[model samples]
Target chain A: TVGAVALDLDGNLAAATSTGGMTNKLPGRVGDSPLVGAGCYANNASVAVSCTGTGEVFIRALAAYDIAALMDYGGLSLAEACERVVMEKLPALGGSGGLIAIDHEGNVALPFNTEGMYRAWGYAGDTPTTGIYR
Target chain B: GKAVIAIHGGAGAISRAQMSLQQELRYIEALSAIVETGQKMLEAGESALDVVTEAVRLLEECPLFNAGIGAVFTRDETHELDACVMDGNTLKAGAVAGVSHLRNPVLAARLVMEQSPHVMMIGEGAENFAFARGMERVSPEIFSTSLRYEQLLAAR
Candidate 1:
């Protein structure tokens, strides 16, 4: 998989995907990098999510969609929804991965079942600040 | 007038050791220059957007940051710059992604927001719009250095 997640200055959300394609794979073998809702997703409705690490497991779990579903159906907050997916559901399904997510309230969650993931966040104000980790 | 403004160049992997002292000094210098630019503009009663553009222009000129002249390359080993400008008063935002040859992507983005009805443009279309608006076009070589070019090739 590729890319993290970003929330724009005006509270709009954007997601970008990039990858080395795949390691030691066939020429036509495509990973989950190009799948919109699979690799990354953003909308005005509920939340925005950018997922990475082990595309196969993420696809099998339908991780991003599952987070959105939990937020919508379970009425969970963005952080809670992300926790449910990356922390609960994905692990239940024997999938190991991570996701960076943000909701309309600007609540954020960067959770992983793996060892680690690269991520960053920032807020717009007089003193614009950002934090990043790997 | 009470106003709130902020800016960022995004985030990525960078180690302190990877960034030499000289590089860090240059970064602080550039950031100071941007702050000075913003102070001057704000004192002159310039719009927040203008201050933001001026500060961002300084950052774009500095080769240390990963934006404008120092932007990351695509999988095809080409630099594709992305930028956005938002008008807080109207909540309108203009953005350009995957632009290849513009010297100042933020200026181009502002023009797209002001002169066109569209919110974004990319690739050759964005470049053509910039050229039509009398923006100076620089060679891809201007955006490259031996170190960055080597990194791009290595990524491919």
Candidate 2:
């Protein structure tokens, strides 16, 4: 249950995340939707992230932040870094849910524990492109 | 399209079988409104930050989704809202959490970045901050629907 956002800053790109906490989560426990690099981490440089999954796991995983590190520091594309993080890293830690992202050049992807997340892509003032199991 | 916008409405569990053709069409329609309106809203602002906050305010008002009006219920039977708005210009981020009786936490989170010197605020403090900024108060019932209510019931 991730709410993802990708925006273009006149060619500079950014990604943002709105996420939640535990399942039937403990009362008064607020997840990391408002937390930096937890719910979202957007830099005009590499990528932006919106995460919805196991919060505690990500609090340590630094899920989105780690993705940026791989891209900016390690010099990976949005797809490679995102795949390594969501597919290899996140689930290895037992995190569930899914994520969406965008890069400075406007490339995009929706990776999860598997495939077929209800996700899409499009341009403003144009018909929105769509999504299927992928 | 250098100044374009792209967005998503959480993840979807609703499959081909779960929703009828008409229902999926309506979801797509609302989804389009959120992104197109979000895109238009951004064009007027200096950067993407303004657009996301604008789009989310539109999102919160609709009972079709969750964020503000369609927010989740705590174990004790009350609505608590969580939201975040980020400035792509500064890469600065602001967020509000567990605030009840709010129409949209995005407004409050936006003000925190623009009005205050903070990145995150929680509970009554965040709610009160938005109030001082002239945010509209909303009824808890406005946030309720049979879908979320049942989720809470099942969780209980």
Q: How accurate locally is residue A18 in candidate 1, as Cα lDDT from 0 to 100?
A: 33
Tens-digit lDDT track of model 1 for A1-134: 22333344444444333332222333333334334456555554566565655656666777766777788788988778877887787778776667666565556676766543433333333332222224
Per-residue C-alpha lDDT of model 1 across residues B57-95, encoded as one tens digit per residue: 655666655556665455555565655554434445455
Per-model TM-score versus the true fold:
0.55, 0.87
Q: Report model 2's TM-score to 2 decimal places.
A: 0.87
A1-134 per-residue lDDT for model 2 (tens digits): 33546565465554444433332545667665677787677787777677666666666788877877899899998789878987888788877656777766777666766434545556555566544344
Model 2 has a DockQ score of 0.42
**How many angstroms is residue A49 displaced in model 2 relative to the true structure, after the best TM-score fit?**
1.9
Q: Which residue pairs in candidate 1 have backbone atoms (N, alpha carbon, C) closer than 3 angstroms, thus clashing?
A: none
- Model 2 misplaced stretches (Cα beyond 4 Å): A1-4, A12-23, A114-116, A132-134, B15-17, B40-46
Most DockQ-accurate candidate: 2
The worst-scoring run of ten residues by lDDT in candidate 2 chain A lies at A14-23
